[PDB]
């Protein structure tokens, strides 16, 4: 891909005797960034998820805006501040201490809870604690135990 078919900087060898602008770029001096609807060398391939998103210039990986999700980043997210949106499904992932599908309700647990269950606010205990709100320590020489009974593991 060299010699008279050589490939000066800011381009890439697409085919062994050819060159095109490096991915994400185009123009007389391979200097302009592709518009969001394109990606790849010389804007030769389509970005499905524009607008409200762009594709990675080289690989084509969809990249939604933060509040967006879907196969085209077409849908907006419902997540509250304490919920990180999932660009594939719209699911809100709650930071520990939050629940509801929007991650807008705070857990009603003691400090030994690792988090709580998104649908119900049910406390999930750090290993070594039990109780409705993970109030109790296990009587199990450090092993974890069953949440309702304290029966060892």
Curated annotation (Swiss-Prot):
Residues 1-31, 39-74, 99-135 form the EGF-like domain. Disulfide bonds join 1-13, 7-19, 21-30, 43-55, 49-62, 64-73, 103-116, 109-123, 125-134. It is found in: Membrane. Endothelial cells. Mediates the binding and degradation of acetylated low density lipoprotein (Ac-LDL). Mediates heterophilic interactions, suggesting a function as adhesion protein. Plays a role in the regulation of neurite-like outgrowth. Heterophilic interaction with SREC2 via its extracellular domain. The heterophilic interaction is suppressed by the presence of ligand such as Ac-LDL. Interacts with AVIL. This is Scavenger receptor class F member 1. It comes from Homo sapiens (Human). The lineage of its organism: Eukaryota, Metazoa, Chordata, Craniata, Vertebrata. The gene is SCARF1.
């Amino acid at each position: 891909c060299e010699g008279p078919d050589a490939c000066q900087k800011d381009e890439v060898c697409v085919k062994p005797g050819l060159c095109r602008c490096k991915p994400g770029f185009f123009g007389a001096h391979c200097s302009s960034r592709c518009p969001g609807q394109y990606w790849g060398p010389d804007c030769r391939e389509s970005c499905p998820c524009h607008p409200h998103g762009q594709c990675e210039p080289a690989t084509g990986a969809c990249q939604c805006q933060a509040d967006r999700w879907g196969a085209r980043c077409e849908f907006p997210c419902a997540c509250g501040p304490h919920g990180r949106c999932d660009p594939a499904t719209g699911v809100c992932h709650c930071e520990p201490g939050w629940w509801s599908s929007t991650c807008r309700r705070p857990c009603q647990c003691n400090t030994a809870a690792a988090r709580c269950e998104q649908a119900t606010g049910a406390c999930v205990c750090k290993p070594g604690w039990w109780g409705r709100r993970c109030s109790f320590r296990c009587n199990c020489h450090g092993s974890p135990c069953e949440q309702d009974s304290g029966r060892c593991a």
